Design a protein around this ligand. Structure first.
Ligand SMILES: [Mg+2]
Ligand SMILES: [Mg+2]
Ligand SMILES: [Mg+2]
Ligand SMILES: [Mg+2]
Ligand SMILES: [Mg+2]
Ligand SMILES: [Mg+2]
Ligand SMILES: [Mg+2]
Ligand SMILES: [Mg+2]
Ligand SMILES: [Mg+2]
Ligand SMILES: [Mg+2]
Ligand SMILES: [Mg+2]
Ligand SMILES: [Mg+2]
Ligand SMILES: [Mg+2]
Ligand SMILES: [Mg+2]
Ligand SMILES: [Mg+2]
Ligand SMILES: [Mg+2]
Ligand SMILES: [Mg+2]
Ligand SMILES: [Mg+2]
Ligand SMILES: [Mg+2]
Ligand SMILES: [Mg+2]
Ligand SMILES: [Mg+2]
Ligand SMILES: [Mg+2]
Ligand SMILES: [Mg+2]
Ligand SMILES: [Mg+2]
Ligand SMILES: [Mg+2]
Ligand SMILES: [Mg+2]
Ligand SMILES: [Mg+2]
Ligand SMILES: [Mg+2]
Ligand SMILES: [Mg+2]
Ligand SMILES: [Mg+2]
Ligand SMILES: [Mg+2]
Ligand SMILES: [Mg+2]
Ligand SMILES: [Mg+2]
Ligand SMILES: [Mg+2]
Ligand SMILES: [Mg+2]
Ligand SMILES: [Mg+2]
Ligand SMILES: [Mg+2]
Ligand SMILES: [Mg+2]
Ligand SMILES: [Mg+2]
Ligand SMILES: [Mg+2]
Ligand SMILES: [Mg+2]
Ligand SMILES: [Mg+2]
Ligand SMILES: [Mg+2]
Ligand SMILES: [Mg+2]
Ligand SMILES: [Mg+2]
Ligand SMILES: [Mg+2]
Ligand SMILES: [Mg+2]
Ligand SMILES: [Mg+2]
Ligand SMILES: [Mg+2]
Ligand SMILES: [Mg+2]
Ligand SMILES: [Mg+2]
Ligand SMILES: [Mg+2]
Ligand SMILES: [Mg+2]
Ligand SMILES: [Mg+2]
Ligand SMILES: [Mg+2]
Ligand SMILES: [Mg+2]
Ligand SMILES: [Mg+2]
Ligand SMILES: [Mg+2]
Ligand SMILES: [Mg+2]
Ligand SMILES: [Mg+2]
Ligand SMILES: [Mg+2]
Ligand SMILES: [Mg+2]
Ligand SMILES: [Mg+2]
Ligand SMILES: [Mg+2]
Ligand SMILES: [Mg+2]
Ligand SMILES: [Mg+2]
Ligand SMILES: [Mg+2]
Ligand SMILES: [Mg+2]
Ligand SMILES: [Mg+2]
Ligand SMILES: [Mg+2]
Ligand SMILES: [Mg+2]
Ligand SMILES: [Mg+2]
Ligand SMILES: [Mg+2]
Ligand SMILES: [Mg+2]
Ligand SMILES: [Mg+2]
Ligand SMILES: [Mg+2]
Ligand SMILES: [Mg+2]
Ligand SMILES: [Mg+2]
Lengths: 88, 100, 275, 68, 114
RNA sequence: UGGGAGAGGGUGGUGGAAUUCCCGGAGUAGCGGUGAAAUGCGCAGAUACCGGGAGGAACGCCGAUGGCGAAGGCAGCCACCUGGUCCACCCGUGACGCUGAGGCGCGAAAGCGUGGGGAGCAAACCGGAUUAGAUACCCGGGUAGUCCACGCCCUAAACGAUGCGCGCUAGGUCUCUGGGUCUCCUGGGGGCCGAAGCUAACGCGUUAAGCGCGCCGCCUGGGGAGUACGGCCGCAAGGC
């Protein structure tokens, strides 16, 4: 799984200010982390459809946040997806 | 790293040098698969509820350990390869659940 | 995975070729090849004794080490895996630390860079050779000697394997690739694993020409011949067989068992093949 | 005559404790119903799981003939 | 000839067979509803099991049989009656253990059993 | 951020019961099967009993008016990988929300392709019965298939015959799983019985079929017909 440590580093790396958890950026980046692992997991467990749904739900969730953040502050979005290498 | 309790049942009609020897292959492997031993409990002979390998008794080891999660499976395999090892069961370690 | 083709000629529509994925070195070891003397199916009298052979691609024989007990305890590195035209299996190049090089037939899962060894003490892992008596019952095994020090004779074809079923005295009991149950002596060497290139059987030759490249010349039906030639020969128009179906030499060919009756190895065969 | 009562504090997750565990088996060897063990739902599930592990180890039987 | 042995009662809805073995497990004699003289469904009755257990035990006693362990398999009608008869036979009956085979959900049963 | 329960999903291992077949032993006149029989099996030694072995498939007790999942569905045990979900803290974001024509994915069983595997079961099929007849029901056999991998099919009484989300309108009792000041209270789930109210009635009733808003899908007499034609999908069967 993801370790508290790995989560923190990400929580910390993306936070807008020291105590920040749950801002848009932190939210998107955490998802990106769970996304890229499941994605990897499914690459090997191609018949794990049940987890694939979750993936979709997350992919969905990250999308809405990105749509929000893009509406609210273009620069922040452009930077975020660029920080995480996201669009396609 | 996570904690598991390796259980092992060995051939009961061994002499103590073979048994020491099997224990050796075992402890080398625990080491080789990056398992760090904590407790250890060797209740030796003990009567089985049913015959294993056509034999009413079994020689019992046990070892609370801390090892890489990815290596527990390969270890259980290597622990089984010996013709004198008759069971392995590596269980995730967990807190007691008390009644009364 | 076998490789398909788009149907851009009538023949490519069904032709499939092997993927050669495991192959890492495309030239044989110069000191391990010798010319194969092509026979055409002719014996030393010059007579065709096996019909319909001739005309295939030229081939160099790769010398294979079917003994292995030859170098007990000396380990080797798997240097490469190569194509061998003389067999269905691929072959693995071994660099012994000794510095001797040999070929073995390449087991499923052999990795180039890995190390193999032979002898009574060899780890029970893919690529190693041990006498059968030191191999755990249940293990699948290939290139098996049929009698001690006589060389690997069993389970050499692409994809094949034998499984150890039990032990009895000086002998172990194997399930052969045919499903025959047979006793083989404990001192006989076998190599752990199955033979690789297991997709071999899914190849579709695709055209007449490809059988031709394999040195397999066209085969003609007794039914298309005349009575001088064959039991099924002649008759006006097409004909059914008109007698029990027979070989060119007259023996019956649908069911007639042919194994010699009083043969000494009958004693060691436990159960004739399945299906 | 509920079993849970006729015992002091014990570990429900302890699969090597054959002396406790073997009391929850019918004389035929079967895992006993909740109505005879006096266990709750949550605990009875932990019981059955550790009895099953135990039978795997050789400590507990999978079945026993019925004597009369 | 042997003094103590075993008595197996195979009791199915169509029949009762009783075979008497030695201590090691090998049969000395056997009987059934068929041997005692019935055909058809009558073989399955309690009176069938009775003659079968008697005639089985009786033949055994003539080989010097005296004590038996009783093993029971099946849930047939003439089961419990078969046991009566072994007791009443002139044989000791040290024990009566039921070792009817039951799967831990194995092979799919025939249709009539679903 | 702390925790929780669970047959949720995928992979790899792995345990005992039973059935079948083979080998060894011991034993003999029947076994089996039905409403009753017969076919069948059996002196070329069956059944029943003991020991050995082989192989596939399903996991008894626990087990529940239980649990998990969006549904299809999911059950021996172990480890790894992984989804959903609930609770407590009231720490962070600042309406970032609901639904959703198209599209995309998943989708019991049967079925299909390529390759495995095949103990039990069993369409087709043979035979015995039953019967006026018996292409059935019952009995003896039996091949696909049922099992695994990979790719297809895309249906269903795929049902709660009940689309999703939100808010509002008495309670009683049983239960699963949390957190409490643990008598008792407070969440989330599963049943029952009911206030108001609904409703053609039957029944529904904080798990609404009540009172309301949002969005979607669907109906408009029976048959002909889920047929024809066309189009799109499919290897075909066939699907929309
Ligand atoms: Mg979510
Ligand atoms: Mg976007
Ligand atoms: Mg072993
Ligand atoms: Mg092609
Ligand atoms: Mg091409
Ligand atoms: Mg192509
Ligand atoms: Mg063309
Ligand atoms: Mg063509
Ligand atoms: Mg290759
Ligand atoms: Mg390949
Ligand atoms: Mg060349
Ligand atoms: Mg030269
Ligand atoms: Mg030279
Ligand atoms: Mg030559
Ligand atoms: Mg010459
Ligand atoms: Mg000459
Ligand atoms: Mg001449
Ligand atoms: Mg010829
Ligand atoms: Mg020729
Ligand atoms: Mg080759
Ligand atoms: Mg090839
Ligand atoms: Mg072909
Ligand atoms: Mg050639
Ligand atoms: Mg040919
Ligand atoms: Mg021809
Ligand atoms: Mg012709
Ligand atoms: Mg002609
Ligand atoms: Mg001539
Ligand atoms: Mg002639
Ligand atoms: Mg002729
Ligand atoms: Mg002719
Ligand atoms: Mg003719
Ligand atoms: Mg002709
Ligand atoms: Mg003519
Ligand atoms: Mg003609
Ligand atoms: Mg002609
Ligand atoms: Mg003719
Ligand atoms: Mg003909
Ligand atoms: Mg003729
Ligand atoms: Mg020979
Ligand atoms: Mg009968
Ligand atoms: Mg026999
Ligand atoms: Mg005779
Ligand atoms: Mg037996
Ligand atoms: Mg706050
Ligand atoms: Mg939606
Ligand atoms: Mg849609
Ligand atoms: Mg489907
Ligand atoms: Mg299916
Ligand atoms: Mg099917
Ligand atoms: Mg198929
Ligand atoms: Mg008929
Ligand atoms: Mg008739
Ligand atoms: Mg019929
Ligand atoms: Mg039938
Ligand atoms: Mg049948
Ligand atoms: Mg069969
Ligand atoms: Mg077919
Ligand atoms: Mg068909
Ligand atoms: Mg329903
Ligand atoms: Mg529902
Ligand atoms: Mg409908
Ligand atoms: Mg909708
Ligand atoms: Mg509506
Ligand atoms: Mg509560
Ligand atoms: Mg509490
Ligand atoms: Mg639910
Ligand atoms: Mg409730
Ligand atoms: Mg329920
Ligand atoms: Mg009600
Ligand atoms: Mg009212
Ligand atoms: Mg209520
Ligand atoms: Mg209404
Ligand atoms: Mg109409
Ligand atoms: Mg249609
Ligand atoms: Mg239809
Ligand atoms: Mg049409
Ligand atoms: Mg429809």
């Amino acid at each position: 799984p993801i370790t508290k440590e790995e989560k923190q580093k990400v929580i910390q790396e993306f936070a807008r200010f020291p105590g920040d958890t749950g801002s848009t950026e932190v939210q998107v980046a955490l998802l990106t982390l769970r996304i890229n692992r499941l994605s990897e997991h499914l690459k090997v467990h191609k018949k794990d459809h049940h987890s694939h749904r979750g993936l979709l739900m997350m992919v969905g969730q990250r999308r809405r946040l990105l749509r929000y953040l893009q509406r609210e502050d273009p620069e922040r979005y452009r930077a975020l997806i660029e920080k995480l290498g996201i669009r396609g | 790293m996570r904690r598991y309790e390796v259980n092992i049942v060995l051939n009961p009609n061994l002499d103590q040098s073979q048994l020491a020897l099997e224990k050796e292959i075992i402890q080398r492997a625990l080491e080789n698969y990056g398992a760090r031993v904590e407790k250890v409990e060797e209740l030796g002979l003990r009567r089985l509820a049913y015959p294993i390998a056509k034999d009413p008794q079994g020689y019992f080891l046990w070892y609370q350990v801390e090892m890489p999660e990815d290596r527990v499976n390969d270890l259980a395999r290597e622990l089984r390869i010996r013709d004198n090892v008759r069971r392995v069961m590596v269980v995730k370690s967990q807190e007691p659940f008390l009644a009364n | 995975a076998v490789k398909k083709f788009k149907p851009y000629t009538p023949s490519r529509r069904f032709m499939t070729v092997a993927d050669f994925s495991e192959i890492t070195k495309t030239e044989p070891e110069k000191s391990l090849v010798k010319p194969l003397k092509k026979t055409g199916g002719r014996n030393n009298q010059g007579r065709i004794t096996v019909r319909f052979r001739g005309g295939g691609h030229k081939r160099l024989y790769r010398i294979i080490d079917f003994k292995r007990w030859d170098k007990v305890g000396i380990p080797a590195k798997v240097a490469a895996i190569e194509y061998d035209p003389n067999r269905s299996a691929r072959i693995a190049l071994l660099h012994y630390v000794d510095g001797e090089k040999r070929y073995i037939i390449a087991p499923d899962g052999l990795q180039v860079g890995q190390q193999v060894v032979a002898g009574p003490d060899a780890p029970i892992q893919v690529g190693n050779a041990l006498p059968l008596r030191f191999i755990p019952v249940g293990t699948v095994v290939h290139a098996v000697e049929l009698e001690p020090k006589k060389g690997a004779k069993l389970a050499r074809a692409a994809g094949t394997s034998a499984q150890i079923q039990g032990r009895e005295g000086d002998y172990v009991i194997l399930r052969l690739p045919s499903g025959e149950l047979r006793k083989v002596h404990g001192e006989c060497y076998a190599t752990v694993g199955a033979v690789g290139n297991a997709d071999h059987k899914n190849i579709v030759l695709g055209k007449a020409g490809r059988s031709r490249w394999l040195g397999r010349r066209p085969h003609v039906r007794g039914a298309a011949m005349n009575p001088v030639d064959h039991p099924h020969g002649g008759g006006e128009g097409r004909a059914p067989r008109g007698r029990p179906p027979a070989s060119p030499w007259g023996w019956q060919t649908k069911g007639l068992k042919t194994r010699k009756r009083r043969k000494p190895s009958s004693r060691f065969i436990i159960a004739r093949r399945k299906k | 005559a509920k079993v849970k009562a006729t015992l002091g504090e014990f570990d429900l997750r302890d699969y090597r404790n054959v002396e406790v565990l073997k009391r929850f088996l019918s004389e035929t060897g079967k895992i006993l119903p909740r109505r005879r063990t006096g266990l709750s739902a949550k605990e009875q599930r932990i019981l059955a799981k550790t009895i099953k592990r135990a039978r795997i180890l050789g400590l507990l039987p999978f079945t026993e003939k019925l004597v009369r | 000839q042997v003094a103590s042995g075993r008595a197996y009662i195979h009791a199915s809805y169509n029949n009762t067979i009783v075979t008497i073995t030695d201590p090691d497990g090998n049969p000395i004699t056997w009987s059934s509803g068929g041997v005692i003289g019935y055909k058809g469904s009558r073989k399955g009755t309690p009176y069938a099991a009775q003659l079968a257990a008697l005639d089985a035990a009786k033949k055994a006693m003539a080989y010097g049989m005296q004590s038996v362990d009783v093993i029971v398999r099946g849930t047939g009608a003439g089961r419990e009656q078969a046991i009566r008869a072994l007791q009443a036979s002139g044989l000791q009956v040290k024990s009566i253990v039921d070792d009817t085979p039951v799967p831990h959900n194995g092979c799919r049963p025939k249709k009539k059993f679903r």
